[PDB]
């Protein structure tokens, strides 16, 4: 019997993991997956970069929070975001978190408070010279420090099957044992049309860059706009290091 060791001394067997993925596919809406997750998991957080998918989840959690509670939000500040991502964060904190006496948890690369700090520590243009090392220092390390310090056992992610590449192989529930977390992907089965429809119907704030072509937004230096025909994440071009953690299992 394979068992998974998680933060806060939680243990999950393969049978439990398999059982959840078998039963949860029977749920008709992401709101149902989210409601179940809320009831089922203590130490439950959302991670977001304020991508459109995760904004939908924030709004869904907000509607569900009246009956239940609002799971806290974790955002990794890579120090290389578009300013527009950061202003959206403030907008989101004001709208959804401040009213509930919460602040968004923000984690940064260790010992750095700015892009210049980062370049001082590791050299200029690191994302060009060593994408792996950059990925680890900008996002993987801060996220891992966060899970451990904030005692996170489970997280919502904004990943979907229709985003393609490695994400078409996604399950509703996953285990990242290296980080000591369970991941829930409640909009796994939602298309981008569905995500946008929800954003529009519920007037949730979204990144201004979307009105300029940015259907997917990462770092200012590694993100380009895309036309309505191209892949959702074509302006980003390999799975992001925070989801594929095993390549940084040494550090």
Ligand X SMILES: Nc1ncnc2c1ncn2[C@@H]1O[C@H](COP(=O)(O)O)[C@@H](OP(=O)(O)O)[C@H]1O
Where do contacts with ligand X occur on this chain (CB under 6 A)?
A: 47-51, 53-54, 74-76, 78, 139, 157-159, 216, 218, 240, 242
Residue 1: CB minimum distance to ligand X, A: 28
Catalytic site includes residue 112: no
Based on the shown chain and the rule CB under 8 A, indicate whether residue 251 belongs to the binding site for its own copies.
no
Name the binder of 218 from ligand X, its own copies, none, CB < 5-8 A by kind.
ligand X
Q: Which stretch binds its own copies (CB under 8 A): 36-44, 47-55, 86-94, 139-147?
A: 36-44
As separate numbers, helices (DSSP H) first and strands (DSSP E) second, the chain gives: 9, 8
Q: Note whether 94 binds its own copies by CB under 8 A.
A: no
Contact of residue 3 among ligand X, its own copies, none (CB under 5-8 Å per partner type): its own copies
Sheet of 181-184, strands arranged across: 105-107, 72-76, 44-47, 154-156, 181-184, 173-176
Of 64, 234, 240, 245, the catalytic one is 240
Assess contact for 237 and 247: CB atoms under 8 A.
Answer: no
Nearer to ligand X, 26 or 203 (CB): 203
Site map 12..31 versus its own copies, x via CB under 8 A = -x-xx-xxx--xx-xx----
Instruction: Note whether 40 binds its own copies by CB under 8 A.
Output: yes
CA-CA distance, 181 to 148, in Å (whole number)? 9
Contact status: 152 vs its own copies (CB under 8 A): no
Distance CA 154, CA 90 (A): 24
Give the span between the Cα atoms of 45 and 144, in whole angstroms. 13
- CA separation for the pair 116, 34 (Å, rounded): 39
Q: How far is CA 98 from CA 4, 72, 89, 91, 122, in A?
A: 35, 11, 12, 10, 35
Taking the least distance from each CB to its own copies, the nearer of 33 and 195 is: 33
């Amino acid at each position: 019997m394979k068992t998974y060791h998680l933060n806060n001394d939680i243990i999950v067997t393969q049978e439990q993991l398999d059982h959840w993925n078998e039963q949860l596919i029977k749920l008709e809406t992401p709101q149902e997956i989210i409601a179940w997750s809320i009831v089922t998991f203590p130490h439950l957080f959302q991670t977001t970069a304020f991508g459109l998918t995760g904004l939908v989840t924030i709004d869904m959690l907000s509607k569900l929070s009246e009956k239940y509670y609002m799971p806290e939000l974790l955002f990794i500040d890579t120090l290389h975001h578009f300013p527009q991502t950061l202003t959206l964060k403030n907008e989101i904190e004001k709208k959804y978190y401040q009213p509930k006496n919460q602040t968004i948890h923000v984690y940064k690369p260790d010992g750095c408070e700015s892009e210049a700090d980062f370049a001082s520590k590791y050299g200029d243009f690191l994302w060009e010279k060593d994408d792996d090392k950059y990925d680890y220092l900008a996002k993987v390390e801060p996220a891992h420090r966060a899970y451990k310090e904030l005692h996170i056992s489970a997280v919502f992610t904004g990943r979907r099957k229709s985003q393609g590449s490695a994400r078409s192989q996604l399950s509703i529930i996953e285990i990242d044992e290296l980080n000591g977390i369970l991941k829930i992907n409640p909009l796994i089965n939602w298309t981008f049309e569905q995500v946008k429809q929800y954003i529009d119907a519920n007037n949730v704030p979204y990144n201004e860059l979307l009105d300029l072509g940015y259907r997917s937004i990462g770092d200012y230096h590694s993100t380009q706009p895309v036309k309505e025909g191209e892949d959702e994440r074509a302006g980003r071009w390999t799975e992001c290091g925070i989801h594929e953690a095993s390549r940084f299992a040494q550090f």
